[PDB]
Design a protein around this ligand. Sequence first.
Ligand code: MG
Ligand code: MG
Ligand code: MG
Ligand code: MG
Ligand code: MG
Ligand code: MG
Ligand code: MG
Ligand code: MG
Ligand code: MG
Ligand code: MG
Ligand code: MG
Ligand code: MG
Ligand code: MG
Ligand code: MG
Ligand code: MG
Ligand code: MG
Ligand code: MG
Ligand code: MG
Ligand code: MG
Ligand code: MG
Ligand code: MG
Ligand code: MG
Ligand code: MG
Ligand code: MG
Ligand code: MG
Ligand code: MG
Ligand code: MG
Ligand code: MG
Ligand code: MG
Ligand code: MG
Ligand code: MG
Ligand code: MG
Ligand code: MG
Ligand code: MG
Ligand code: MG
Ligand code: MG
Ligand code: MG
Ligand code: MG
Ligand code: MG
Ligand code: MG
Ligand code: MG
Ligand code: MG
Ligand code: MG
Ligand code: MG
Ligand code: MG
Ligand code: MG
Ligand code: MG
Ligand code: MG
Ligand code: MG
Ligand code: MG
Ligand code: MG
Ligand code: MG
Ligand code: MG
Ligand code: MG
Ligand code: MG
Ligand code: MG
Ligand code: MG
Ligand code: MG
Ligand code: MG
Ligand code: MG
Ligand code: MG
Ligand code: MG
Ligand code: MG
Ligand code: MG
Ligand code: MG
Ligand code: MG
Ligand code: MG
Ligand code: MG
Ligand code: MG
Ligand code: MG
Ligand code: MG
Ligand code: MG
Ligand code: MG
Ligand code: MG
Ligand code: MG
Ligand code: MG
Ligand code: MG
Ligand code: MG
Ligand code: MG
Ligand code: MG
Ligand code: MG
Ligand code: MG
Ligand code: MG
Lengths: 136, 52, 386
Amino acid sequence: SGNGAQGTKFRISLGLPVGAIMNCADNSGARNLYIIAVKGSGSRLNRLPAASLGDMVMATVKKGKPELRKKVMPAIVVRQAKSWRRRDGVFLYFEDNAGVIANPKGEMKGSAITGPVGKECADLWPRVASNSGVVV
Amino acid sequence: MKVEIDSFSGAKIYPGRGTLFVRGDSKIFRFQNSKSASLFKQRKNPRRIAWT
Amino acid sequence: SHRKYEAPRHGHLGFLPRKRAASIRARVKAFPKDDRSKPVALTSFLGYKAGMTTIVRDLDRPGSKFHKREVVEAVTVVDTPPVVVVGVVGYVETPRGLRSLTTVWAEHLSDEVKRRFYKNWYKSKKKAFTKYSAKYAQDGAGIERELARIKKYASVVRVLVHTQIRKTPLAQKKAHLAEIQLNGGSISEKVDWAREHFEKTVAVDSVFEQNEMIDAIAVTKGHGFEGVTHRWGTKKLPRKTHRGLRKVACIGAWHPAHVMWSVARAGQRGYHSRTSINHKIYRVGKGDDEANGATSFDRTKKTITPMGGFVHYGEIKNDFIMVKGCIPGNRKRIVTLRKSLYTNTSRKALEEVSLKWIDTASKFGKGRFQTPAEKHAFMGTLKKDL
RNA sequence: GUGAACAGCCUCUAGUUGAUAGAAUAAUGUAGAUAAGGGAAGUCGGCAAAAUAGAUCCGUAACUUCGGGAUAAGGAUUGGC
RNA sequence: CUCUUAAGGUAGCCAAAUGCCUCGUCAUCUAAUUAGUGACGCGCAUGAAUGGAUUAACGAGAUUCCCACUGUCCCUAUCUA
RNA sequence: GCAGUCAAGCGUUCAUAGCGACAUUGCUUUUUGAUUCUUCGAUGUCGGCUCUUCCUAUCAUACCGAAGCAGAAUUCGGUAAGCGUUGGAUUGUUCACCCACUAAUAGGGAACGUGAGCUGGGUUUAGACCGUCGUGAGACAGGUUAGUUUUACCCUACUGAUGAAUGUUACCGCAAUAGUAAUUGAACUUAGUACGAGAGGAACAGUUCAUUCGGAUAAUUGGUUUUUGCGGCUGUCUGAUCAGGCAUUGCCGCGAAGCUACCAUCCGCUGGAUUAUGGCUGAACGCCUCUAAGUCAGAAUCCAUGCUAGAACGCGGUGAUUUC
Ligand SMILES: [Mg+2]
Ligand SMILES: [Mg+2]
Ligand SMILES: [Mg+2]
Ligand SMILES: [Mg+2]
Ligand SMILES: [Mg+2]
Ligand SMILES: [Mg+2]
Ligand SMILES: [Mg+2]
Ligand SMILES: [Mg+2]
Ligand SMILES: [Mg+2]
Ligand SMILES: [Mg+2]
Ligand SMILES: [Mg+2]
Ligand SMILES: [Mg+2]
Ligand SMILES: [Mg+2]
Ligand SMILES: [Mg+2]
Ligand SMILES: [Mg+2]
Ligand SMILES: [Mg+2]
Ligand SMILES: [Mg+2]
Ligand SMILES: [Mg+2]
Ligand SMILES: [Mg+2]
Ligand SMILES: [Mg+2]
Ligand SMILES: [Mg+2]
Ligand SMILES: [Mg+2]
Ligand SMILES: [Mg+2]
Ligand SMILES: [Mg+2]
Ligand SMILES: [Mg+2]
Ligand SMILES: [Mg+2]
Ligand SMILES: [Mg+2]
Ligand SMILES: [Mg+2]
Ligand SMILES: [Mg+2]
Ligand SMILES: [Mg+2]
Ligand SMILES: [Mg+2]
Ligand SMILES: [Mg+2]
Ligand SMILES: [Mg+2]
Ligand SMILES: [Mg+2]
Ligand SMILES: [Mg+2]
Ligand SMILES: [Mg+2]
Ligand SMILES: [Mg+2]
Ligand SMILES: [Mg+2]
Ligand SMILES: [Mg+2]
Ligand SMILES: [Mg+2]
Ligand SMILES: [Mg+2]
Ligand SMILES: [Mg+2]
Ligand SMILES: [Mg+2]
Ligand SMILES: [Mg+2]
Ligand SMILES: [Mg+2]
Ligand SMILES: [Mg+2]
Ligand SMILES: [Mg+2]
Ligand SMILES: [Mg+2]
Ligand SMILES: [Mg+2]
Ligand SMILES: [Mg+2]
Ligand SMILES: [Mg+2]
Ligand SMILES: [Mg+2]
Ligand SMILES: [Mg+2]
Ligand SMILES: [Mg+2]
Ligand SMILES: [Mg+2]
Ligand SMILES: [Mg+2]
Ligand SMILES: [Mg+2]
Ligand SMILES: [Mg+2]
Ligand SMILES: [Mg+2]
Ligand SMILES: [Mg+2]
Ligand SMILES: [Mg+2]
Ligand SMILES: [Mg+2]
Ligand SMILES: [Mg+2]
Ligand SMILES: [Mg+2]
Ligand SMILES: [Mg+2]
Ligand SMILES: [Mg+2]
Ligand SMILES: [Mg+2]
Ligand SMILES: [Mg+2]
Ligand SMILES: [Mg+2]
Ligand SMILES: [Mg+2]
Ligand SMILES: [Mg+2]
Ligand SMILES: [Mg+2]
Ligand SMILES: [Mg+2]
Ligand SMILES: [Mg+2]
Ligand SMILES: [Mg+2]
Ligand SMILES: [Mg+2]
Ligand SMILES: [Mg+2]
Ligand SMILES: [Mg+2]
Ligand SMILES: [Mg+2]
Ligand SMILES: [Mg+2]
Ligand SMILES: [Mg+2]
Ligand SMILES: [Mg+2]
Ligand SMILES: [Mg+2]
């Protein structure tokens, strides 16, 4: 999470450190999302901040509509490739890393999400959950 | 509790076991272990794998 | 001078010296506060760690994403045959601390226990408690009047119990003997209870119970001499560093001109005494039972031992405690299980659990089958058989 | 023999089997490997490592002293019978 | 037009391995650039075989960035001699 | 660099809520200087990396007092160093400056901590280009490029490991002393409430999670592979086959076991005494006053509980003690 967020994530395995580039699963016109910082993130000497499913990240768009580039913006993680472990006992993992552009309240800039979305993310951000395709 | 089935080896997947893969489209995949997972990532074929 | 950036220190200074324990049996350093109003009780219990397995159960935690849902948890199964009382020891308050005043032993002592007092049993003349028993012979007096003094002195009464190690798949024939504090009412009623339990048996279900949090006192699996990197946690030095990099770089400032008690050095890792608390009891096994591993839901007649036996341990043919998560020490090693030193209302502490399913597949590999019944009821018939 | 080959790898003739030895396999090393997710965020600096690679057939930019640039780049293929 | 010791910086070129001020100003590249490049030039102290400017090809030379690559790192673990 | 005394002024009004001029008393030794006492038969000279510990002039976190404190936010002050104080772009830099996260991104010391610990980017040998200077050889805290980072087996210290002697040998124990640990954020709810004209907008109790740290652990998932365990492949060699050798483990796929990861899972206690402060009763002083006597409440503090070691010259209970 970070805030603007409804509910609470149980901890899930991190896979998207600073510098990770993930796919942009929305119709915003952005193709990349370059993670420059993670919202929750604590501090530890030389730990890269790393996001996981359904966290809010600060990101920049490396590829897409010119208007959408050379600036930082919140994004929300809807898919991660790093396998994580649900309390129901299953280690699952999506096939790529996707994120959706969002404002600080959590409201997507887009209106549609290509790809499936992990439920943990959907439960965190209703507005994400709205425009979502298949969830989990 | 539910037992699943390996979508490669046709094995029984009791809870906690193996891995769950959520492909591009949304087709969910299950492997009881790292072996049938590896064969799947290798693009082998259950129909030609004698123990499946 | 003032480190460029801050970080918390590596390691815990409260678990020093990182030296090898002085007994593979970890010492119960504390017993619960006695409430001398309840029946006479054992406070801890001996047992052998047998291995782990997985569980399934609905969680009861109102206000959680996973409330009224199934979770899968890891558990450890400790092999717990009934223990046997062979004496009681009497401790008196002094301005120098608790003091053992006398110990009184049972008349007949099992071979297992006797073995404990020898280094070379086989070539011994086994004279272990041979003269002591005579104290009983003369109708009483001797013994009779030592119990007498534990009664009038002694602020605390411990029993001497020992494991029946032979019920265990363990090869070790020598048994384990430990003092266990009695926590039922009145000194007198305590030594009475001990007296009456001489040579007799005590089982777990008479001490522990389901949903109860208990502590686990054992000696950590050893690893011998360890470098600083793994022993303390310490960052790895860069690739380019000459003379090795699994070190720490600055063992100290110039002043104090002494390597200090608080910096990481290589040495022993493992084989330490740990007192791990708040492990919740998910199952009290009955040895006579043949549905040890069964459930109100999963009705099938199976015992707790996984297919192929607990790896490096064997089968559980005895009573057992099955506890949530993990406990210190490794398979085959003696554990003390102590009941909590406090009354935790954690709500997590208070949750009553009902197991729905107990994993009983093989652990010696990527197991696929719970019962050989099930295996064959899937594989078909093989080249052997029929 | 393989192969473009006095390459590498295996062999025949000939020649050696000589470099203190035994028991263990802690830390730390020297030398050789691998690593989920991320992918230079490490660092003075991609140092070190990794990646590419043979051959056949397609394809190939700016620029240029018109000779080059050029294996530019970018693709497909490759066994056995 | 003028002062001065013979004259008084042309053609070019540039914060360049030559610029003090200086981390120059503008533009560009980045989330962010004492870095890089393109430009500007009263240029402390550029400048014409004390060679100036251009320049294809070439370089175990100095430097910037991209793609690929990866245990350099996040953050360590494991194996062999 | 930091802190005071004065109180002209600022602060609608009002010196002192928060500030404070003209003057003036101090403190500090991470600045720079001044000196030249120590080292020139030699104390390795910047930065960073790594790690420990200390100071407090406190940035965060606990509890308070104050306000020009309505609420929210903030600011001033007390007890407080128990606990934390980060990820990056440019630079050899310390410094600086931006982006970004955050509860907060406090300032310092430890031979300007730390080179038989690293690194060697800068600096400052010898090669070389420029520019300024010089007739020249050459010079230049001007720019630039390339430039060997040695030894520990000794003592001590630190980490772990044995161990003679107290009749012998064994078992169970005591606890002096020493160490000691947890940390921080959010959501829900309280509540669109208290307060407020509006804008806005809290907290205690309760619930769920998370950050950082610590200790274990290996059911599970993942990593590792000389299980050279099974299979596949290239070259060659054993006449063929079968089955094998050699290719410094020939290659590739899977691969149990062990080891192992916020890449995995579990676990991380509760009593007291205080501090600031606010009070009680109460004189001094027939009033008044938290204080003088006495005394209540009270903090991330302290002391215990708990947790680690167990004094090898601290101790207790108990068993057996020789025909070769
Ligand atoms: Mg760093
Ligand atoms: Mg800009
Ligand atoms: Mg595996
Ligand atoms: Mg500091
Ligand atoms: Mg180590
Ligand atoms: Mg070196
Ligand atoms: Mg296993
Ligand atoms: Mg010869
Ligand atoms: Mg030799
Ligand atoms: Mg290998
Ligand atoms: Mg990797
Ligand atoms: Mg990539
Ligand atoms: Mg850096
Ligand atoms: Mg960098
Ligand atoms: Mg450089
Ligand atoms: Mg360089
Ligand atoms: Mg290289
Ligand atoms: Mg590699
Ligand atoms: Mg590879
Ligand atoms: Mg041409
Ligand atoms: Mg073909
Ligand atoms: Mg003149
Ligand atoms: Mg002219
Ligand atoms: Mg001319
Ligand atoms: Mg110029
Ligand atoms: Mg030029
Ligand atoms: Mg320059
Ligand atoms: Mg860039
Ligand atoms: Mg750069
Ligand atoms: Mg330029
Ligand atoms: Mg010139
Ligand atoms: Mg000339
Ligand atoms: Mg010319
Ligand atoms: Mg060259
Ligand atoms: Mg006023
Ligand atoms: Mg006034
Ligand atoms: Mg003011
Ligand atoms: Mg001097
Ligand atoms: Mg000298
Ligand atoms: Mg010295
Ligand atoms: Mg030297
Ligand atoms: Mg203070
Ligand atoms: Mg106060
Ligand atoms: Mg006022
Ligand atoms: Mg106000
Ligand atoms: Mg507000
Ligand atoms: Mg405010
Ligand atoms: Mg002040
Ligand atoms: Mg401290
Ligand atoms: Mg941070
Ligand atoms: Mg100093
Ligand atoms: Mg120094
Ligand atoms: Mg030194
Ligand atoms: Mg050195
Ligand atoms: Mg140097
Ligand atoms: Mg240098
Ligand atoms: Mg030189
Ligand atoms: Mg240089
Ligand atoms: Mg060189
Ligand atoms: Mg020496
Ligand atoms: Mg004697
Ligand atoms: Mg509401
Ligand atoms: Mg108002
Ligand atoms: Mg709030
Ligand atoms: Mg660990
Ligand atoms: Mg295992
Ligand atoms: Mg033959
Ligand atoms: Mg045949
Ligand atoms: Mg041979
Ligand atoms: Mg050879
Ligand atoms: Mg081989
Ligand atoms: Mg008072
Ligand atoms: Mg008083
Ligand atoms: Mg007074
Ligand atoms: Mg009173
Ligand atoms: Mg009091
Ligand atoms: Mg505390
Ligand atoms: Mg504790
Ligand atoms: Mg002891
Ligand atoms: Mg002793
Ligand atoms: Mg000694
Ligand atoms: Mg003794
Ligand atoms: Mg005796």
